[PDB]
Design a protein around this ligand. Sequence first.
Ligand SMILES: [Mg+2]
Ligand SMILES: [Mg+2]
Ligand SMILES: [Mg+2]
Ligand SMILES: [Mg+2]
Ligand SMILES: [Mg+2]
Ligand SMILES: [Mg+2]
Ligand SMILES: [Mg+2]
Ligand SMILES: [Mg+2]
Ligand SMILES: [Mg+2]
Ligand SMILES: [Mg+2]
Ligand SMILES: [Mg+2]
Ligand SMILES: [Mg+2]
Ligand SMILES: [Mg+2]
Ligand SMILES: [Mg+2]
Ligand SMILES: [Mg+2]
Ligand SMILES: [Mg+2]
Ligand SMILES: [Mg+2]
Ligand SMILES: [Mg+2]
Ligand SMILES: [Mg+2]
Ligand SMILES: [Mg+2]
Ligand SMILES: [Mg+2]
Ligand SMILES: [Mg+2]
Ligand SMILES: [Mg+2]
Ligand SMILES: [Mg+2]
Ligand SMILES: [Mg+2]
Ligand SMILES: [Mg+2]
Ligand SMILES: [Mg+2]
Ligand SMILES: [Mg+2]
Ligand SMILES: [Mg+2]
Ligand SMILES: [Mg+2]
Ligand SMILES: [Mg+2]
Ligand SMILES: [Mg+2]
Ligand SMILES: [Mg+2]
Ligand SMILES: [Mg+2]
Ligand SMILES: [Mg+2]
Ligand SMILES: [Mg+2]
Ligand SMILES: [Mg+2]
Ligand SMILES: [Mg+2]
Ligand SMILES: [Mg+2]
Ligand SMILES: [Mg+2]
Ligand SMILES: [Mg+2]
Ligand SMILES: [Mg+2]
Ligand SMILES: [Mg+2]
Ligand SMILES: [Mg+2]
Ligand SMILES: [Mg+2]
Lengths: 64, 76, 51, 96
Amino acid sequence: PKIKTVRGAAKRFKKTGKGGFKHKHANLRHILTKKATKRKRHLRPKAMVSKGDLGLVIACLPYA
Amino acid sequence: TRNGRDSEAKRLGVKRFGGESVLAGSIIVRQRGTKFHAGANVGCGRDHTLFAKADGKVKFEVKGPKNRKFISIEAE
Amino acid sequence: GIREKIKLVSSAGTGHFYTTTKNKRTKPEKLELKKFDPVVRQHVIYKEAKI
Amino acid sequence: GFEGGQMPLYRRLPKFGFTSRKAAITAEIRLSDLAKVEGGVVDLNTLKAANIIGIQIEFAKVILAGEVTTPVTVRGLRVTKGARAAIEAAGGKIEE
RNA sequence: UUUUGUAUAAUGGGUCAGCGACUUAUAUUCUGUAGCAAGGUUAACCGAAUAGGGGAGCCGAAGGGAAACCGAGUCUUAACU
RNA sequence: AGGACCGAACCGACUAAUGUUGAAAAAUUAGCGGAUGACUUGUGGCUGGGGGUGAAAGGCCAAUCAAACCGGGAGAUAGCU
RNA sequence: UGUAACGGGGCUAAACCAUGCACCGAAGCUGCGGCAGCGACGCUUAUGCGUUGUUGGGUAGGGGAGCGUUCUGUAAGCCUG
RNA sequence: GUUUAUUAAAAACACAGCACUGUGCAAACACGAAAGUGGACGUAUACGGUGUGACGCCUGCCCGGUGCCGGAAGGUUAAU
RNA sequence: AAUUCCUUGUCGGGUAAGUUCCGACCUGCACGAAUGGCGUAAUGAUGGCCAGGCUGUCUCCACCCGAGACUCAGUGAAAUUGAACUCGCUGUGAAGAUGCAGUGUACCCGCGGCAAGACGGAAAGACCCCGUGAACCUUUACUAUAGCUUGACACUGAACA
RNA sequence: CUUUAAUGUUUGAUGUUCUAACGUUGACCCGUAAUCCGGGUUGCGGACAGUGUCUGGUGGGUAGUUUGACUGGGGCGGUCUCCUCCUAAAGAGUAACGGAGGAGCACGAAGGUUGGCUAAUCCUGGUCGGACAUCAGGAGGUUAGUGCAAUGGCAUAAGCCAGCUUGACUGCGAGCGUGACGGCGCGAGCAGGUGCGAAAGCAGGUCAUAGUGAUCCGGUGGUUCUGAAUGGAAGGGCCAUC
Ligand SMILES: [Mg+2]
Ligand SMILES: [Mg+2]
Ligand SMILES: [Mg+2]
Ligand SMILES: [Mg+2]
Ligand SMILES: [Mg+2]
Ligand SMILES: [Mg+2]
Ligand SMILES: [Mg+2]
Ligand SMILES: [Mg+2]
Ligand SMILES: [Mg+2]
Ligand SMILES: [Mg+2]
Ligand SMILES: [Mg+2]
Ligand SMILES: [Mg+2]
Ligand SMILES: [Mg+2]
Ligand SMILES: [Mg+2]
Ligand SMILES: [Mg+2]
Ligand SMILES: [Mg+2]
Ligand SMILES: [Mg+2]
Ligand SMILES: [Mg+2]
Ligand SMILES: [Mg+2]
Ligand SMILES: [Mg+2]
Ligand SMILES: [Mg+2]
Ligand SMILES: [Mg+2]
Ligand SMILES: [Mg+2]
Ligand SMILES: [Mg+2]
Ligand SMILES: [Mg+2]
Ligand SMILES: [Mg+2]
Ligand SMILES: [Mg+2]
Ligand SMILES: [Mg+2]
Ligand SMILES: [Mg+2]
Ligand SMILES: [Mg+2]
Ligand SMILES: [Mg+2]
Ligand SMILES: [Mg+2]
Ligand SMILES: [Mg+2]
Ligand SMILES: [Mg+2]
Ligand SMILES: [Mg+2]
Ligand SMILES: [Mg+2]
Ligand SMILES: [Mg+2]
Ligand SMILES: [Mg+2]
Ligand SMILES: [Mg+2]
Ligand SMILES: [Mg+2]
Ligand SMILES: [Mg+2]
Ligand SMILES: [Mg+2]
Ligand SMILES: [Mg+2]
Ligand SMILES: [Mg+2]
Ligand SMILES: [Mg+2]
């Protein structure tokens, strides 16, 4: 039968033009008042999944 | 009372040594106080990190009446 | 422990706010500070309100 | 995705976004597609008939991809700046 | 066989003969190989039945953005050196 | 008269030896307790498994009962050997 | 438990220190013959061969090349009273 | 008297006796989705549950905790 | 003390000598009144202690009668078993050796006996720990639930104050 | 209308009776040579009891499960994240139930800037005044101070005061450090706007290093996003925050 998407992964990663994955930074959900504005600024933009983690993400998203 | 504790090591120390060519912005030494002071084309960050303000070669010197240590950067 | 989170609100129409903390015992009055409002892109007076 | 018990990467990180139902009935057209339709007139219908866009597509954009070497009359389609320059260079026509 | 390490006084086998354990289906990706190539391929089904018909679909030649949307760009920001 | 006394049958099972690949998957020999009683025994009946029954030992319920036996879920699961 | 604190016999050096030259001694090194992996280049590449340096212990494990068994085609062929 | 049929027969279980406590009878209690039944063709000198354990001499103090019994004013409090 | 750790408590009695026994003391680690206290004749294949008789229980074993064991004839198993040409000692060594080193000793093969060794046989240690195993049991652990109980509505109406 | 009483009404509140739903495990009749059942008569009760749905309480009676790891075996004790020092072998890192301590905050000034200033300790003198308060001189020279542990810094002070103040700014970021990762850190410079200074300039919090909690779900505000026929709306996204 068809492989099943790990559906929670599919709500956190998106495949980019050269085959990597973009994702949202952790730590910008709450407990924000104490966090420097600088630090939070740099968590806003999306980031790329690291080399160590691509195997894991790709395993979870066979149809990405 | 009981012992058994310590903290994570902070990896302080010299990152670029004498003669090394660096791009501007590169951290040259992480330190807790100013063991080393910022010289020409070198800046001091809030945790006393010394960094390059210009592309060039790292240069350690001893200067002034207190025989203090300074890191500067020479154009190459 | 006693230090409470408050928000400083822009006195312009905008609903922009900064967030900070306060010792409400020792400092019972309203914290009020000029700060930069990124929506009208100017410095304006900001006034404490509840988080 | 299992990592031994550690909060795994796909839970560590936050969810983002929503899905646009509109994107799915919106297609892109290449310049190389404009000659492949019988009649030199490019509509939603024409493109469907020539099998270039899906049957349920309700909006389409001609983009600067490939080339167009024949006069074409595009119609009821959005056209990119580049594509408009390319379509018109080859004697073509764009209209709402 | 298991172990850092077994002649080990650790495990297993009295001996022989026959049997006895990485398969199969469907998805998916990579390598090798073959076909065709900005295209490749059809599925159910029809059938003249391993042909031929069937291009419904699917993957690919376009990305960026949460999205609207713009598009060889796009997003970020009032705007980017 | 008596859940009276001694003592065979009958019911039981305190001690020891033997036996322990037994004559026997619980016995045999020598001794032992009850023996008109809350006694003992034949035939048939009723109670059924989280259920029975239990003068209560988790005892017994067809030779292993802190949850019988058979068939099924069934190739349960086994990060162990 | 039995010499049992040179492995033994035995040694007054066959012990110890010093100098020296000889010899024994390994699957190390050389010599002769041979196979293969990787290179390189040749007489001359349809791709193996021929020269030529070098390499060739190995568990878990990865890679490469093969043998043999049963069945289908080749096969109404080929072998076989 | 009973008991661990098959390593324990005993000081263990039971026992007559004692106490507490429920139960007005379509009883309480128990087996049953129910119907039906046991209790009992009994009826408080009866029936159930709990503890103690012939008999003799006896059985003192504690109601804060936990359990149970009784209470209605006040607070709090469900569906609606 | 079926209860006492210290403990063989201390004192007395019994014995030549008594960590048990009986009697007493009270310093009750940690008795006590129906979780019953303290007594109690009788009963008891019940626990502890003493004495008479009795004796192979013992000093210390002897003789004897029978069933086996032994021999012949007939029938004819078993557990176990990697392969055996299957000695001692001291040492070495996965650290307790028939098998290794050194050395001693030993012609080849049975039968009756003995159990020091083959870490002998038998049962994938029951102790101990581990597994995000199993079960049954407890409770003011968690979550539910039968049962019991509360009230609203339904079956459920009328008259009169 | 000022007000008051009483006959007429809706809904309750409460009560007293009634009979007709319903109960009868009282007597009788028939089906019927029947201690079941049904119909009928009669007596006793009676809108109660009981049952259905909903609901609060009770509920080891039953059920399904949980009840951590590290550990010189386990258990008891202790410990589990973070900061500082030593062990640590002169770059980084480096273990033990090794040796010592600390954090889970504070501060609208204890932040920014301009301008200024300089400790500890001892000797001598001095009302009350003492070993030690405040005053003067001298020695001393940072041994002081740093909101707090330790270590490294600190005089150009980073230590101490005052004036003006909100840079404890918003968008970004060349280039680096440190991480398996999630992440965490340092950063000149660019745009907008601001404070202080005559100016050069300084300021994106605090001498630095602890002072912390991923994701999910949900709340609040904002919004040129989305909006299941269409216009809205709900819900979702995005930004801020809890
Ligand atoms: Mg948010
Ligand atoms: Mg199509
Ligand atoms: Mg071992
Ligand atoms: Mg060996
Ligand atoms: Mg062995
Ligand atoms: Mg074996
Ligand atoms: Mg075989
Ligand atoms: Mg009798
Ligand atoms: Mg007998
Ligand atoms: Mg008798
Ligand atoms: Mg019978
Ligand atoms: Mg199954
Ligand atoms: Mg199985
Ligand atoms: Mg000798
Ligand atoms: Mg010599
Ligand atoms: Mg040799
Ligand atoms: Mg060799
Ligand atoms: Mg028995
Ligand atoms: Mg017995
Ligand atoms: Mg009793
Ligand atoms: Mg009492
Ligand atoms: Mg009450
Ligand atoms: Mg005696
Ligand atoms: Mg006594
Ligand atoms: Mg008796
Ligand atoms: Mg004889
Ligand atoms: Mg014979
Ligand atoms: Mg052996
Ligand atoms: Mg054994
Ligand atoms: Mg085992
Ligand atoms: Mg009622
Ligand atoms: Mg309910
Ligand atoms: Mg409960
Ligand atoms: Mg339970
Ligand atoms: Mg389960
Ligand atoms: Mg453990
Ligand atoms: Mg170091
Ligand atoms: Mg070093
Ligand atoms: Mg300060
Ligand atoms: Mg100054
Ligand atoms: Mg003085
Ligand atoms: Mg000015
Ligand atoms: Mg809302
Ligand atoms: Mg709609
Ligand atoms: Mg709509």
